[PDB]
Design a protein around this ligand. Structure first.
Ligand code: HEM
Ligand code: HEM
Ligand code: HEM
Ligand code: HEM
Lengths: 141, 146, 141, 146
């Protein structure tokens, strides 16, 4: 469960990414593809170059989705309802992969905003990305 | 699998820049803040109720320096990670009774600490080299668990 | 999420254990202690004999708790609120252990009621024990 | 760790009673019903929308017989489980691209299928012998993942 303080924490570190959703989003996927190359089987049709049009556009959608999630952090199931059906039912993404992308999001914030991602902030953000992952893996079958 | 020449060079060049005492204290502190059940394994270090207590615990800080210096010895034994860590693995299993799933969680925290102290150097390819290292070290610690 | 059908399923297989909470409960712990001996560090003060008074009494409490959970399967967080504080805050049980006990519960039902634990029933029961485990691991710190 | 004489005898005596075709079909069917994302790895077997489809899929049933007969070969190679499975491990990683966390989940399902077909024999000590076997087989499949 996310406390009131976790929620303040997540909103505040999230605000640092506000103008950089495509940038940060693209970097996180680049990192997930390179550090966990098994994730590439889900994107057979992507150009896997650095700063590829396809990766920039998908990195934006991902982080735009995570941005609405933060803005509805009280009701994550409703905020991510359609996404959970896409990921679990239509794409059958193996639930281990959500841990990989969550770790890469955390790495992007640490690179770009090292002081802001203090230990207690790091704990809140990690709680929020587990919560989002749980909603996205909630609808298998 | 063996580290290639390029993997090796990323790893070896980053690690020469790392402050092992400060990153080790940082990594150990964050793991007890992010995953609070791990505190049970260290109930002999004392004050671990909140995150202020942890950040101010001298024994936690000290221990973090050793854990990272140990991990740092993988960098001189890239060809032999499982063999180098085999006794430690025993010690964790038998003496400290630590569930081997937790080694992967520390390894991720270490990636985050390195990323924050070395941002220009922690590129996409460098991060992939280090992720492979951390996966091998966590596997070598879990290996003598029988 | 547990569907309406999962819920019918869980209630019906649960009813088979109704007169055997101590029996089934004791057997599940015996199995968890023997097959995952690392779980014994949490019970330093227990007699670890077969059909020990301490194990019979704890096996009953566990399955009695799981029986109220089934009876409140719509509101698991409220049904298990006090338990979640005990396990996560006071005892700091490592979250891997909840998977071990859940597997042993499933083994007990398979031994005692092999026909009833059909594949679709097996899927519902496993969803319910993950849901209970998630509530019990929800309060770390 | 080596199986002792007593572990060996439980294992060897239970497995002589096992119907490998029926338990293998049972185990494979249940794993696709209980963990539906695993269906993606078999999208070439056809009809896997619901549990009726799975239970009636002849290729799923057939495949379950092989998987369990393979697993059954561990019982003749108790001293050498990691070595016996090394090629299969390669095949899973490279050709079928299966995430190694899933091997532990099949191993648990196999315990449940054996428990249901052999209740008088699947005692507390027998179940502990088999759990150790299943943990070693899952580890030998994950071992060549580099
Ligand atoms: C934070 C976690 C995640 C979020 C918020 C997220 C969000 C999204 C969004 C917004 C879309 C676009 C949906 C649309 O256009 O209607 C999408 C598609 C997709 N996602 Fe995710 N996703 C996440 C995790 C993952 C993971 C871990 C994988 C695979 C390893 C993955 C694989 C896909 C794939 C394959 C598509 C289809 C994309 C395509 O058409 O090319 N997602 N995701
Ligand atoms: C990179 C991963 C790890 C490495 C390299 C590592 C290394 C070490 C080293 C070198 C020691 C000191 C051994 C000695 O006393 O001679 C140690 C002790 C210990 N480790 Fe680890 N460790 C790792 C991960 C973990 C994890 C994840 C946990 C718990 C969640 C843990 C819990 C302990 C405990 C409890 C001790 C004993 C502490 C004491 O009594 O002073 N370690 N470890
Ligand atoms: C379905 C999962 C579980 C349920 C429903 C459950 C339920 C309970 C209940 C009802 C109690 C008694 C609390 C009281 O008397 O006020 C308790 C205590 C306890 N539980 Fe659990 N529990 C579960 C899982 C676990 C696991 C996985 C472990 C450890 C591996 C564990 C370790 C303990 C311990 C150490 C106690 C203290 C017992 C004592 O005083 O001797 N529990 N649990
Ligand atoms: C005890 C654990 C396992 C054993 C002993 C095992 C054994 C086998 C064997 C013998 C084959 C046939 C190899 C061949 O074609 O020559 C196979 C194929 C395969 N296995 Fe596994 N397996 C195990 C676990 C798993 C798991 C957990 C998954 C997926 C979640 C999986 C997915 C596959 C797939 C997709 C194939 C290829 C199917 C085909 O194209 O016919 N296996 N496995």
């Amino acid at each position: 469960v996310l406390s009131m303080e976790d929620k303040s924490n997540v909103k505040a570190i999230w605000g640092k990414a506000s103008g950089h959703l495509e940038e940060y989003g693209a970097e996180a996927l680049e990192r997930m593809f390179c550090a966990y190359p098994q994730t590439k089987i889900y994107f057979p049709h992507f150009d896997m170059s650095h700063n590829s049009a396809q990766i920039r556009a998908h990195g934006k959608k991902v982080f735009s989705a995570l941005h609405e999630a933060v803005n509805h952090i009280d009701d994550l199931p409703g905020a991510l309802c359609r996404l959970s059906e896409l990921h679990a039912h239509s794409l059958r993404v193996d639930p281990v992969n959500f841990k990989f992308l969550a770790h890469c999001v955390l790495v992007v914030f640490a690179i770009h905003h090292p002081s802001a991602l203090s230990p207690e902030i790091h704990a809140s953000l990690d709680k929020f990305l587990c919560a989002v992952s749980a909603v996205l893996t909630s609808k298998y079958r | 699998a063996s580290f290639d020449a390029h993997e090796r060079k990323f790893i070896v060049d980053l690690w020469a820049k790392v402050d092992v005492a400060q990153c080790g204290a940082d990594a150990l502190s964050r793991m007890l803040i992010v995953y609070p059940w791990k505190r049970r394994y260290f109930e002999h270090f004392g004050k671990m109720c909140n995150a202020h207590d942890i950040l101010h615990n001298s024994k936690v800080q000290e221990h973090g320096k050793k854990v990272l210096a140990s991990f740092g010895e993988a960098v001189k034994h890239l060809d032999n990670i499982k063999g180098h860590f085999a006794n430690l693995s025993k010690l964790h299993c038998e003496k400290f009774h630590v569930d081997p799933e937790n080694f992967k969680l520390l390894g991720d925290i270490i990636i985050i600490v390195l990323a924050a102290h070395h941002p220009e150097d922690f590129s996409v390819e460098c991060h992939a080299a280090f992720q492979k290292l951390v996966r091998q070290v966590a596997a070598a610690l879990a290996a003598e668990y029988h």
